[PDB]
Design a binder for this molecule. Structure first.
Ligand SMILES: Cc1cccc(Nc2ncnc3c2cnn3C)c1
Ligand SMILES: Cc1cccc(Nc2ncnc3c2cnn3C)c1
Ligand SMILES: [Cl-]
Ligand SMILES: [Mg+2]
Ligand SMILES: [Mg+2]
Ligand SMILES: [Mg+2]
Ligand SMILES: [Mg+2]
Lengths: 194, 194
């Protein structure tokens, strides 16, 4: 039934633009919406990737590897899956493995790759692939992994046991001013609910 | 160690604004970011998203989801029921109300998250994730009455919790819908548990 009629640029930065979207409602009436988009999306099947990195080690419980960074939009520190935007011509899988190594030091193995999923669809068109990666933490490459962050990127790695992830997250939120990412929290809730 | 120095208004619409954030990086260098905010926030968060666990005896437990046209996306999305928190509403109350409006179901609060960020490299948007159980055998949830507002048009999609990830993948392959990242994350963790 519904569809876009027009998209009008309101304002365009270096990284983000705001648009006035006109669309057709299912009753047949024209309506508008204010839409956010990134300026950096070319032919990628998505803007970015987030990596679900399952750290596996003999005689250890599996960990989920997370990153903590300052997020200017939020005015504070956030705990998130490792993530970045997909470079032009780069596959979601390569992006995921590359970002994971850059942000964490770990060299993963692809497990699965989602279709493009929407970040906040009442607001933006932004999409990612969620890439599940296993990390063989018994491999020498992953022994004392060092982040290789880019210029102006500053990241702390936090590995939490999968079998207690929601409580460990809650305990971190209790001890500091920090925000957990909604995807991380969703994943931790399902681990509990399962 | 990092913090916000100033925020410059770039553009303000009715619903969304775009700002240029200046912040101190940990090296003591000053840096900028483009940040999106909603103009509607006061509340602990912009919105709520409901994880609605439909429980009917002798049936699989279902997660109740919604499908709607999303003008930013230019298409249809499958999401947790959700909406913005009304001024002076509790997150729990916003959760029950949205769940009723969007699905017709009347549910019970199980747990409620802290405020969690939607896309923190882009926006300051936050939600509470509220886990709600729905006693699908009660008479009030027999023929659920969705009471949605002016211009909302929602379809309800219940999927079994124990196969959620494979059911979503299917809807994407066949219906060309975009699944929400939080929904997808939850689904992944149901599979990844143990
Ligand atoms: C339920 C309802 C009725 C009529 C209009 C709206 N509009 C919006 N609701 C939420 N976010 C919005 C907008 C428009 N832009 N952005 C970003 C909502
Ligand atoms: C790694 C790096 C170095 C230098 C600049 C950037 N900037 C950004 N990266 C991603 N999204 C962004 C921005 C600025 N605004 N928004 C929204 C990133
Ligand atoms: Cl539950
Ligand atoms: Mg990143
Ligand atoms: Mg990065
Ligand atoms: Mg809604
Ligand atoms: Mg609503």
């Amino acid at each position: 039934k519904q569809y876009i009629i027009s998209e009008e640029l309101i304002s365009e930065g270096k990284w983000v633009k705001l648009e006035k979207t006109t669309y057709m409602d299912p009753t047949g009436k024209t309506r508008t919406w204010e839409s956010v988009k990134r300026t950096t999306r070319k032919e990628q099947t998505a803007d970015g990737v987030a990596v679900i990195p399952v750290l596996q080690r003999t005689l250890h419980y599996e960990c989920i590897v997370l990153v903590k960074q300052f997020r200017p939009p939020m005015g504070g520190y956030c705990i998130e899956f490792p993530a970045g935007l997909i470079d032009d011509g780069e596959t979601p899988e390569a992006a995921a493995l590359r970002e994971l190594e850059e942000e964490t030091g770990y060299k993963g193995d692809i497990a699965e790759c989602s279709p493009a999923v929407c970040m906040d669809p009442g607001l933006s068109n932004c999409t990612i692939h969620i890439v599940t990666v296993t990390i063989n933490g018994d491999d020498a490459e992953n022994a004392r992994p060092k982040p290789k962050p880019g210029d102006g990127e500053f990241v702390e790695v936090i590995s939490l046991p999968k079998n207690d992830l929601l409580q460990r997250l809650d305990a971190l939120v209790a001890e500091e001013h920090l925000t957990v990412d909604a995807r991380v929290y969703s994943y931790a809730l399902a681990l509990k609910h399962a």
